[model samples]
Target: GKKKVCYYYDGDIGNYYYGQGHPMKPHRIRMTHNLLLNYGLYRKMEIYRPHKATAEEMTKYHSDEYIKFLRSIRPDNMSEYSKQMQRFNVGEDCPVFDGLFEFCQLSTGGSVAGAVKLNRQQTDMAVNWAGGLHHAKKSEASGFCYVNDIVLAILELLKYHQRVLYIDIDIHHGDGVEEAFYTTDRVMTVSFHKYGEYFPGTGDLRDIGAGKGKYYAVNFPMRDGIDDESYGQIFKPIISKVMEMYQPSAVVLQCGADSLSGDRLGCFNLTVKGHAKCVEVVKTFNLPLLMLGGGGYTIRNVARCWTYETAVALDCEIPNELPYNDYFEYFGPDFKLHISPSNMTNQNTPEYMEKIKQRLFENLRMLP
Candidate 1:
């Protein structure tokens, strides 16, 4: 039988708005969906509109008290849970808005549904572009993530898999997911992100996992302005080593479009082709892959990158011209899939990356 790809999406997900002037926008999901349709990418795969994840399912990863707050929160009732508000860190990044909890449930349901399919051997690869909100914690939310969908999905994978590999390319450290499984060997987390004085401020190269999970947590604390070639140089070899050494039965890939060249918050200079190549490399292993989305701030490019990556997942080729659609105006002059590179200097030297590879491989040697 031929391999199959399954995708999860619902039109209602795009209806949730964070706040006025907030960078994290759910409407981008709709825009990405539009692009996928324009390229006819949706015709190549099996699509499912998943039911919302229930409160019981959310409690598998989040605290009971926090879940109650998220469910019962509103603008008028702000004073009742002041202590809990600070406890969950829900002030700014994780904002309270219309249908906030419903949004969380919808996004998480897709990932959990994808995981269940892989567990049941129903699909070779599953995609939930709404999932991969990796910054949420068991007891709190951080970095615009209300629910830790990655953790929930990985937990589902761990039911059937002895070990699962969690790969994050969000240009931000997958801090919440990393923290969730810090003391366990069942999950190995690898994140490639712009490291410096940045948001969330985690994923330092030296900050590998503690206890039984040591050497399993790998962080490519990347330099600013890392282009496609340099990105491939480090991303490919190290991931190759991980695939060989770890031999995980399942993989959860967080393909964040923020790493693209012109992303509003990202510093990397990876083109859509280069970014999707990461997916291409991981797919060769033929594991039960659960592809999830993460932090992609620039709405237009986010839409473009994910739509292009969706095509990559389908193993289909698309044309140069993007067909006329409702949001065609967003595509601007060149409505093509290809994009011009932003002038970002490669801060990561050959010497620097080679040393990093040696150090990381040495850590791998320490693994069982």
Candidate 2:
């Protein structure tokens, strides 16, 4: 069946930098757009310049102080706000870069707009490349994320949908989103991430949920070098059961490219197709799906991954040959689209995976 796909891409979003030498690159969003355009994907979907998220809208999930802090902080005035910066955890990983607030607004706005589109049944799937900063907390920034767009988007989604399922495929845990709905059964958060000594480590398989949210917060804490086949072994069955049990009205997937193989800040060995397979699986459910970008440090791969996933969302298959665009030089040498997974050892033995799978199934059985 032909799906209605509404894509959100603000042209200015790519100009917002996360500071020099920073792993988070907004420029990669632009690179992705170029690939989409050059590959003739632009004609296949409706593209909208995203709405700028207001501080009031952000305050729906983030605290008033945090939103104010995000709105006021600037690079030149860093000296004056040092204490506030420290309080909000915004100095290092979440830097006071130029246009910090605007960057947050654009990304958050698109995610919200995507939800709005979903609510209206205007589009079957909405893609926002600049959104999905899932590490952001309600009151503090962590892991290069500020103003949790995903949480805010979910809040918007909950207004209409009885239940919403949040899926995170980032190398890092979707702590912010999981924490936001930690005590509620209205939203279920599932995260597949590299665990044990990883940055912002919090997604343990045992920490399902509390009170009404019991067994709703699903965490698949993975080992390093989890390839496509191995990941699907757990991902498919778990998500399949989740869809059956939870029966969510809508879904939000955080397509973080850091999970892709060869990412500078990532350890997982997932190829572009491996990473996009998550998207393909979610799309199969035919729910009102909101897709957003999260973490992917390798700029070129990030661009390729999202572009290919965008094609996936549209059920459009693209070629392995690279498309000529402004960033064509970036995909040099072989100049192909797909990337191969590394030969890293699959630390997740089948025994370990089976145990994790059974535990999750037991927990799911307990779900009311």
Candidate 3:
């Protein structure tokens, strides 16, 4: 009667395919599930299969025109919407895959459901590993993300919290979520991502929020190949300051697994424990929390990262030895829970780190 670490899953989260050669992977979701169950940690938390979100639910953040296009378009029927394709920017980054619209609904549903449980105080923390589609806009898609479920979930949180903090650790910038609340003070968005020579070409250090949202939008545009020491050093300090400054009633952590080393598309080199340590620090605030998944192309590492993060949220320690499971073959070689140090070159200089933190601190001081 005392445990309430709730997990929401879409049964079809693993079934949907983003087509071949696409970095967006669904099998990673299944892999994460396998690890959670195999580690004997799944029983520690409450689990629910979320109901699919409907067209009306999507319109809360997306435009009706965008909804119609997403609802009707498919890979084979591109000709029917070819003229609309360019307008929506759905060609290469966000492909028209099988069960495209339904997949969006499924993921969005889990995110919104997690938010619901948090708002009702039914759970201290909520997790939806399929959520965190942070690149979708009101009318378009980008970066393999179609619906921007994170925005939808934060919008739900606004019904309860005076201020909601959106923290993203994805290797890529959370452009869609930042843009959604770019001018609102009710929500504060912070993203740490690969900035220079990166995809989306946004999340610059100088692009803080505007209007009523001044000083609320924060960015850490790290260069390629950042390590665990560099990442943890900055993350805990800045996030602690954010908590002291904003005092948010709740926090939404976008735990993107792609930021780990060895990802096909990711450039950073954070380890699984190092990444989840961000979760560890946030948990100290004792606020209602929601965690969502984002970009993580290397499915094995992604699975390992989330599995460990789940244990962190539940306040449990797991065995380092990999347990026997259906996906045991996936965690080959070492077959352990920990990740080795990244092989990427450390590009973050001490001088550069000083400049960014100083800049963000200066910006935070300007908050009214």
Candidate 4:
């Protein structure tokens, strides 16, 4: 069966740069778009420019003061916003780059609009390749995230959905999103990431939700170099059980390409197809799904992974050979769609994964 997929993208999205040496790149979004176009993927879905998320829309999840700071601060006026920068944690990782506020608007706009479309049944699935900065908090920026788009999107979804399931496959923990709905039973956040000594380290097996949200926040603390089969071994059974028990009205999956095998910042050994398999698993549920992009440091692979995932969402399989596009040289040498995983040792043993799985299943038993 074919899906009615709506893709949200801003033509100027790629123009927003993080910094000279920063790993977070907006250009990858454009690269993914180009690949999508050349592969004739645009014909398969409805494409729309995002609705430019306004300040009022953003403040639903972010604090007013922080949103004001992001709107006013610029690359030139560092001294003026010196105090505000430290207060909001907007330095090295989340820099006050050019068009910082507008960048947030474009990225966040897509996610919110996608959720709205889902609410109205405008599309069966919405793809926001420029959204999903999961590390952003209510009043502060962290890990190259300025606004909590996922939170805001889920909030919108809650108006129509009894429950919304958030699944983050990003290599880093989705701390901000998890924190926002930490006390609400309406939203459940499940994150699979490298836990020990990682940035924004908080996703432990014991930190299931608090108060009414108890047993709602699920964390699979993974180790380095988890391959395709190993990932499927853990991801499939867990998500399968979650869908059956939680029975969410809507679903949001954050497809962060950083988890790919050769990412500049990722540790996992997941191939493009391997990461897209998660999307396949979620799509099988046939729910109103929202797919967004997140942390993918290796720009080229980020493009490849998202392009592949876009095809997956449309239930279309593109040829493995690279298509001729603007960024042809970027995919030099072999010029193929997929890449092989590294020979890194798989640290996540079956016993360790089984124990965590059982604990999570036990927690779900307490849910209403």
Q: What TM-score against the true fold does each predicted structure earn?
A: 0.98, 0.99, 0.97, 0.99
- Error at 312, model 2, angstroms: 0.7
Clashing pairs in 2: none
Kindly list the per-residue Cα lDDT of model 4 for residues 1-368, writing each as its tens digit. 78899999999999988888887879999999999899999999999999889999998888899999988999789987888899999978888888999999999999999999999998999999999899999998998899989999999999999999999999999999999999998999999999998888899988999999998999999999988988988898999989988999899999988889989988999999889999999999999999999999888889999999999999897999998999989987788899899998989888888888888889878876
Model 3 Cα lDDT, one tens digit per residue, 266-358: 888888988998999888888899999998998889999999999999888899898988888888889998888756688998778878988
lDDT of 2 by residue, 216-259 (tens): 99998989988888888888899999999999999999999999
RMSD, every candidate, angstroms: 1.2, 0.8, 1.4, 0.8
Best by lDDT: 4
- Cα lDDT tens digits for candidate 1, 1-368: 23689999999988888889899988888888888887787777898997899999999989899899899988778788788899889877788788888999999999999999999999999998999898999989898998999999999999999999999999999999999998888899999888899988999889889999888899888788888888888888998999889989999999988889988888889888889899988887888999999888878788878888788777887876787777888888787776767887889998888898888899988888
Question: Which regions in candidate 4 have their CA more than 4 angstroms from the true location?
Answer: none
Name the lDDT of candidate 2.
0.91
Error of 4 at 331 (Å): 1.0
Off by over 4 Å in 1: none
Clashing pairs in 1: none
Q: Which pairs, if any, clash in model 4?
A: none
lDDT of each: 0.88, 0.91, 0.89, 0.92
| Residue 161, candidate 4: C-alpha displacement in angstroms | 0.6
